[PDB]
Amino acid sequence: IPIPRPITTPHNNFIIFNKVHRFLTYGLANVVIPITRTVNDVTYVDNFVITSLGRLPVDRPFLYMNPNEFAQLPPGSCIEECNVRVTAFTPRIAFQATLNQNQFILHATGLNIKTQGVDVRPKEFQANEPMVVSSIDELGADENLFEDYVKEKSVPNHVPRHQFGIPYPLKNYFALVLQQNGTADNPGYECLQSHVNEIRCNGPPGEIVEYNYKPQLGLIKKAIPAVYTGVPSAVGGNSTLSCPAGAGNSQYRTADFTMTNNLRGDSETFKDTVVSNWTIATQIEKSQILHAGAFPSYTPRAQPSLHIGVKPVHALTTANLDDNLNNANFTDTQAYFIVEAACKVRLQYPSIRPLFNGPNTIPDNQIYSSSTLQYTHAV
Amino acid sequence: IPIPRPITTPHNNFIIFNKVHRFLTYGLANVVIPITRTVNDVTYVDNFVITSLGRLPVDRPFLYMNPNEFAQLPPGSCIEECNVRVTAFTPRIAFQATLNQNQFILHATGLNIKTQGVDVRPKEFQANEPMVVSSIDELGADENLFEDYVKEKSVPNHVPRHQFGIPYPLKNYFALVLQQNGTADNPGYECLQSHVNEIRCNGPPGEIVEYNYKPQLGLIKKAIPAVYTGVPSAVGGNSTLSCPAGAGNSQYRTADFTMTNNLRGDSETFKDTVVSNWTIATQIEKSQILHAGAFPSYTPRAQPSLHIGVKPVHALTTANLDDNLNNANFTDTQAYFIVEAACKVRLQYPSIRPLFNGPNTIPDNQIYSSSTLQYTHAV
Amino acid sequence: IVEAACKVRLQYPSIRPLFNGPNTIPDNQIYSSSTLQYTHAV
Lengths: 379, 379, 42
What we know:
Chain A has 379 residues and is an all-beta fold.
């Protein structure tokens, strides 16, 4: 009368990575870099306004790991959590004619979605040091953008940034922008100051904010699929009833009229397993659905800055001219994650799962950047 | 100053049925019954693998009731609950040359959805007793399939199975299958053993599992509709606004590539009251919506078996040849349910309800079997 | 009361036994009550 036979399905796992970089921003001139947008009839010029603000590839994996020795071997793996903490200090002024002043320091957390302006603009300079004077559209560039950074390769003459624990400057600064040229019926800028924080860091202001994110669908590899059977030709296919109710269709839209919001479309497409992602936006949720679902997605983006030391004395009316500050911000991170060996059919390799398996995708694969125009998610 | 007038709308009710059948499985040869699938070019042959496993029309009403004296008079009635309990015993071996051995017994619960293989295959035999050697596709057959069973009619020469409390054999055995012929890039079978339970029932192993199910939408009759008015021609029709949001459209899909999952469509249709169900799948939820909704549905299916007594002695290499076992499984059931006299308009007959009334259906009526290829629901 | 007392599997739609439903007067008599009661319908 006893029972005998025991067996089972899965086998999950975890692991993390630790990294500590040294970066630096600079009291970038808080100015207007207007760019001439031209159609059949050139007008509506976008006036970008720079901010000393920086950006941390926090949303990108390389920031957290070994290049390859690390973006290595985790088939089907996802990163559930991760976080960082800047902890910077006192600004390195220089006079290449001011002396002393109150250097304020600052940072703000992924204001990216709630600030319409974007982090594009690593620009060009002038005869007055910190001086954005050309800003290049760091946008629509999406695995090459944050791709020079990747050097932390072939050229040994870029002392591996990390490993050797070497300082660094960031090349992407934030800014806000406005399309105002046609006539004068264009409102002002957003209350930037509102989303940010000043300090009068006497010395080493020590540690700043600790960023933390639990990416919704932090996938970062192809996922294992399943194995149908029961109604055959080489590659069978069955279609069964259900109660929707509008099964998700990678649905999205919006549109505007003269800087004023008004329009919203929707576009619908179909669901099929994804077959790809070296180091790309980990916040992989707006283009992924696992198995049929209903989700509207979002994302965050830390940044650190030293404000800016203005140098106006006994000089009156339409004046801005500034001072330099090199500041040693001190980030470091933790990338937590899943791992897997969920196998299914004895003979097949190397990983499987069921029918209610890995996330489905948009047939024609769409993928979205984030260095230009967020609203509530990657444009 | 007193109040006078009292009245009201509905009148609900309950009732159940009790039945006790005697069935029997047999230590069906645990073998491969390959079937030749042929297109313009015959290939990809499906290799079915039999299992002593049985099946209990648990999902079908007749199992629970009087034929007609019972599938009788419950207009609009539904069955909310129901359950059974096998409680079998010691296997009846015979030597038509083995003597004694350890007969293991077993059952498993509706593994149907989580086992890709189906319960088709009541087959044919050989010169070696328990010997599936032909399996017929008990599938796509849907009120005739479990229709011989119905005799428990005109022919008095089928001693009413029940009533007289007579034993019985089941004619539908489960199995798993795989489409593997073209070349050798086809994985193995599913870990069947994983979903099942062996016993070394010394004697009368007594009672086994008690199956229980509370069908989502256990309708089993036409339902009463309502009565519009207010904007007339003979049969008026009005169309009012709402906030969807994608009102359910009997939505469904999927498809595959070489035994590997990958595709999923969706197809949309409209909602209108159903006008029908003698004895058909009670688990009537994947084709029914009551009044506008959003549901993805599922189902379960008990089965009982006596494993199999293998007879290999002093015989070596590519050997299977087996022994017979007749086992007296002892099921019995309870079918609970609703009943109704919800009336509305005095003069109309014989039953009504409101505008938010009985379940709507697929215009062209689709209906789905379950003796072939489940995934997560009737194919 | 209400009922679903069934008996023989195959027959429909309701049954009961031999000691079953009320018997009646062969030629069916039926009595009014808007005229002359004594102790019951005239």
